[PDB]
Amino acid sequence: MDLGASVTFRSKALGKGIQQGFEMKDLSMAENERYLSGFSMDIGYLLHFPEFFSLFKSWGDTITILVINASSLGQIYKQMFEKKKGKIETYSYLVDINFEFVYFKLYRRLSQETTKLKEERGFLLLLQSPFITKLLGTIRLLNQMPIVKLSLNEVLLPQLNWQPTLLKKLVNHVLSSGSWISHLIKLSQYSNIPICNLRLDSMDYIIDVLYARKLKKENIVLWWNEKAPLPDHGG
Amino acid sequence: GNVLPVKIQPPLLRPLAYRVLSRKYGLSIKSDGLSALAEFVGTNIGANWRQGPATIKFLEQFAAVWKQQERGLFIDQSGVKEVIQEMKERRDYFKVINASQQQRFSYNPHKMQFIFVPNKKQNGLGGIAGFLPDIEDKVQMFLTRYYLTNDRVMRNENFQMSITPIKNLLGRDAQNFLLLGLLNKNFKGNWSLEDPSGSVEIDISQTIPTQGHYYVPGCMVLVEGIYYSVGNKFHVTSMTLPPGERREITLETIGNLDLLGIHGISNNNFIARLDKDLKIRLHLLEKELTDHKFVILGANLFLDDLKIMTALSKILQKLNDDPPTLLIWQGSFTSVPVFASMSSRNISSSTQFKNNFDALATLLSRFDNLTENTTMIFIPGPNDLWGSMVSLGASGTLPQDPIPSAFTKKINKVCKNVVWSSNPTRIAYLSQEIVIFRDDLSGRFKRHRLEFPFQKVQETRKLVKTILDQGHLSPFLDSLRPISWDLDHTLTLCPIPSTMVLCDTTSAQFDLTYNGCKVINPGSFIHNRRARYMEYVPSSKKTIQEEI
C-alpha cells in the first residue's frame, strides 16, 4: 500500500544496503506509475486438469502432455489461429506458430522441466490448477521466480471424449494468454500494483488497496483484517 | 442341543417348568419361555426326566439371571437370549457421552429432590422436529440454577446467619442484611440483584470484595450490606462467591444416584441406586491403570498448513510403537471459518473442508498400530462447520452439534473407533468422571471484570476457584452466550466430575487440583516454534512432553 510498485531510492551506502537488507522506514517514497515498463521477456506456462499436467514454452517449439490426438491438436490450433488472427496480430508483441506434439515414473518430470527452465532462463510463470498451494509445495524450485497466477478452477471431465474439449481448453488458454497479460498490464499500470499480486477476479483487492491508502492518508484506523471475514475491533 | 438331542413332548415337560416357575419363584411363563426351556433341555439331554438336581439348579440360575432385568414377570423370544447369557456367565465398562444424549433431571424446591424427565426422543415421534425446546424452558432454566445454588448455600456447615429474600427488604431500613442472587445490569444502566421474590439496586462505592474471584455479571454473589429506604440503594460492605462442595458429600445427599449411570439407569417409574460395585470398580482401577493410559493434544490443530501436518507426523511416529487407550484431538481443524461461498471460480469452502479430512485418512494408513489399538475422539472448536457457518468464527451456542457425517466419510472406515461429540462432552470411566470443554475463558473473564472503586499462577487459581464455586460451565447471561433452552442441565456442575479438561488457548498449561477436583489446562498445540501435548496418568500424576 504505502510504497506501491513504483519504488525508488534517495540515499545520496548502496553496496552495504544491497549486501544486507535495506531499511525502509527511514528512506521511502513512491514515484509516478503512468507507464510500468516496456515488456519484452519470455513467459512460463504450467497447467493441470483434474493426470493432465501440461507445459509450454513461448520460445520453445515442443509440446508434451503427461499421461488421433496429434492431428486433432494441429487442426484445432490452425482453426482457432484463423479464428483469432486479429487478436494474435494485436498481441504478438507480448507473446508470439506451430509446434510438435507428444503424449507421454512419468510424474517426476515436473522438477526436471522446472530445473531446465531455471538454468535456461531467469521468465514469468503462468499457472492454472485447482491445487495452487499443493503444486507450490510439491515443487521446491517454483519459489525462486516471480509467478503470475491465473487460477480458474472447477474443471471437470465429461467421462467420454475428453480429448477434444481439453484440446479446446488448452488452445484457447494459450491463444488468449496475450489478452490476459495485456489486461493485467493495464490494471497494474493503472492501480499501482505489482503484476504478480494481481488477479482477473480479484477486483475487491484494488478497492481495498485504494480505500486503505486513502484512509491512511487520513486519521482513521484501517480496521484491516486477514484470514477472517470480520472487521478488526481490538478483540 | 446335545450331541444326541431327543425331541421332547411339551406336555410332559410342562409340570416340571410350571411347579418351579409358579410355586417357588417366578410367574407367568409364556409359550416362548417354554420353548426356550425346551431347547435348553435339549442341551441337557443327559439322563433327563430322571436327573433332579442339575435341571432345577439351572432353573434357579435362570431365575438369578432374569430377576434383575426389568421385573421378570414375562419371558418372550428373549428366552434364547437368557440361555446365551447362561452360557456366557458359566478395557470395557467405560463410556463416552455427549450433551445430546445426557439424561434429563429436573429439580423441585418444595420436595428437595431431583426428578427424572422423560426424553422427547424416546416417547415422542420426533419425525419432523423433536429437538426444538418449548417456551417455558428458558423461563425455568434460571430458576433451576438459582434453586441449585441456594441448596448448595443452605447445605454449608457455616450457614444453618440466615439469608433474607429480596421482597422482605421493603419495610425495614438501617439494619444489616444478607442476600444472594443473580448480578446483572438493569434496563436503566445500574447494578441490580435479582431474586425470584424481586430485585433491588446495588451500591458499590464502599465495597470490599473477597479476592481470588472473577466478579462477573451473571454470577451468584453473596451480598452483605445495609438497606436504605430513603431511596432504594443497598450499600454493600462485602461480597463473596458461595463456597463449593466435594463429590462424596454431594452424592451422599442423594445416596448414589445413577445420573451418569452405566451399570443402571432410572426412569419415570422408579429411582435407582448402587454402592456395592463402586469399591469393586475402584480396586479394579487401582491395577493395570498405567497400561490404560490416554493422551490428549493441544488446541487448534489446523489441517491446511504443512507445519502442523509435519509435527503431527512426528507425533504419530513416536506414538505408533506404544498405542495408548484414548487419543483425543481438540480444537478447530481449519484455520479459516467456513461459510457461504460467493465465488464460483475457486474451490468451495465446503469442498475444501471435506478435502481437509481426506488427507488425514491417508496419513493414518502408515500407523496401523495406533489405528488398530487406540480409539479416536474428535471435538469441534470455535469455527467448525456448524458454528462458523452462522457465527462467522465468533462465539455462539454452547451445545455444539457434532461434525457432520457427510464430511467424515473416510475417517470412520480407515479407523475402527472414531467418536465425534459436542463441545462439552462426558466420559465415564470405571471410577472416574471426566468432562472436556473447549472455549476461551481467560480473555472472557479479563475483559468483563467488574471494577471496584478504591506471578501468572494466580490468574489460573482465580479462574479455577470461580468456575468451581459457581458450579457452572458458562457463568454468563443470555446476552453473551446463548444457550439452548433445555440442554442447559448438561452445562451444570452438580455432579462435580472428578477431573475436568479445561482447554484454553489463552491460558498457560497447568495441573492444579482443588475442592477434590483436579483440573488440567492444555495449551495450543503449536507455540513459539514448538509442539506440545500432555498425557494424564489415572493415578493423579501428569506428564508433559514436547517434540520440536
C-alpha–C-alpha distance, residues A73 and A58, integer Å: 17
- If you write DSSP's letter for every residue of A10-78 in order, what string do you get? ----HHHHHHSPPPSSSS--B---S--------EEEEE------EE--SS--B--B---HHHHHHHHHH
DSSP H helices, B204-293, are 247-252, 276-285
E strands, B42-175, are: 95-98, 105-108, 113-116
Q: What is the DSSP string of A96-139?
A: ----B--B--GGGHHHHHHHHHHTT---EEEEE-S-HHHHHHH-
**Rg of the Cα atoms in chain B:** 29
Q: Which residues of B touch A135 (CB under 8 A)?
A: none
Cell of B187: 434496563
Which approach determined this entry? cryo-EM
User: How far A83 CA lies from chain B's nearest CA (Å)?
Assistant: 26
**Which residue of B306, B347, B443 is in closest CB contact with A130?**
B347
Contact residues on chain B for A228, CB-CB shorter than 8 A:
336-337, 393
In chain B the first and final C-alpha atoms are separated, in Å, by 63
Residues of A with CB below 8 A from B339's CB?
229
Contact A228 B336 (CB under 8 A): yes
Rounded to an integer, what distance in angstroms lies between the CA atom of residue B398 and that of residue B403? 14
Strands (E), B26-175: 95-98, 105-108, 113-116
Nearest by CB to B345, from A152, A228, A229: name it.
Answer: A152
Q: What is the rounded distance in angstroms from the CA atom of residue A122 to the CA atom of residue A119?
A: 7
Note whether A194 and A205 are within 8 A (CB): no
| Complete DSSP assignment for B416-431 | S-EEE--SEEEEE-SS
Q: Which residue of B has its CA nearest to A131?
A: B347
Would the CB atoms of B346 and A235 count as touching at under 8 Å?
A: no
Q: Do A228 and B393 touch (CB under 8 A)?
A: yes
Which residue among A137, A153, A230 places its CB closest to the CB of B345?
Answer: A153
Give the three-state DSSP class for B177.
Answer: strand
Length of chain A, in residues: 235
Nearest in space to B353 (alpha carbons), one of B377, B375, B383:
B383
Q: Note whether B87 contacts A: Cβ–Cβ < 8 A.
A: no
Q: Distance, in angstroms, between B344 CA and closest chain A CA?
A: 8
> Are B425 and B433 contacting, i.e. CB atoms less than 8 angstroms apart?
no
**Which residue among A154, A229, A235 places its CB closest to the CB of B344?**
A154
SS3 B176: strand
Q: Angle at the Cα of B48 (from B47 to B54), degrees rounded to 5?
A: 95
User: For residue B400, what is its C-alpha cell?
Assistant: 455444539
The residue length of chain B stands at 548
Among A130, A152, A227, whose Cβ lies nearest the Cβ of B336?
A227
Does any CB of chain B come closer than 8 Å to the CB of residue A204? no
- Residues A14, A17, A18, A23, Cα dihedral to 10°: -120
Going by DSSP bridges, is the β-strand pair B191-194/B208-209 parallel, antiparallel, or unpaired? unpaired
Q: Is residue B72 left, alpha or beta, with left meaning phi > 0 and alpha meaning psi from -120 to 50? A: left
Are B229 and B222 in contact by the 8 Å Cβ rule? The answer is no
Give residue B219's identity as a one-letter amino acid code: C
For residue B443, list chain A residues with Cβ-Cβ distance below 8 A. Answer: 235
* Contact between residue B242 and residue B149 where contact means Cβ atoms under 8 Å apart: yes
Q: Are strands B499-503 and B433-438 parallel, antiparallel or unpaired?
A: parallel
B304: Cα within 13 Å, side-chain hemisphere: 17
Contact A153/B at CB under 8 A: yes
- End-to-end distance of chain A based on CA atoms, in angstroms? 24
Report B:294-313 residues touching A (Cβ under 8 A). 306
For the beta carbon of residue B480, count every other beta carbon within 10 angstroms: 13
Give DSSP secondary structure letters for B328-360: EEES-S-SS-------SSS--HHHHHHHHHHHH
Phi, psi dihedrals of residue B487, rounded to the nearest 5°: -75, 5
Neighbour-count burial for A169-203, b at 16+ CB within 10 Å, e otherwise = bbbebbbebbbbbbebbebbbebbbebeebbeeee
Query: In sequence order, which residues have a C-beta less than 8 Å from that of residue B475 and are 6 or more positions away?
Result: B216, B218, B219, B466, B467
> For chain B, which residues make up each domain, given as ranges?
94-157+242-548, 161-241
Which residue from B253, B42, B388, B156 is spatially nearest to A230, judged by alpha carbons? B388
- The set of cell numbers assigned to B538 is 489415572
Pick from A151, A201, A229: CB nearest B339 = A229
Q: In B, residues 416-445, which contact A (CB 8 Å cutoff)?
A: 443
Can you list the alpha helix ranges (DSSP code H) found in B90-196?
A: 120-123, 136-154
Question: d(Cα B285, Cα B432) in Å, to the nearest integer?
Answer: 9
B153/B443 Cα distance (integer angstroms): 29
Cα nearest neighbour of A230 on chain B: B392
Residue pairs spanning A and B at CB distance below 8 A: 28
Cβ neighbours of residue A233 closer than 8 Å, sequence gap 6 or more: A223
A152 Cβ under 8 Å from any chain B Cβ: yes
Mutate to test the interface with B, among A133, A154, A204, A232 (most CBs of B within 10 A): A154
Chain B: nearest CA to A227, how far in angstroms?
Answer: 6
Give the DSSP letter string of B186-228.
-SSSSEEEE-SS-EEEEE-TT-EEPSSS---TTS-EEEEEE--
Residues 6+ apart with CB under 8 A from A221: none
CB A28 within 8 A of CB A2: yes
CA neighbor of A185 nearest in space, from A108, A226, A124 = A124
Q: How far apart are CA A148 and CA A163, in angstroms?
A: 27
Given an 8 Å threshold on Cβ–Cβ distance, is B345 in contact with A201?
A: yes
- The answer to whether the CB of A175 falls within 8 A of the CB of A87 is yes
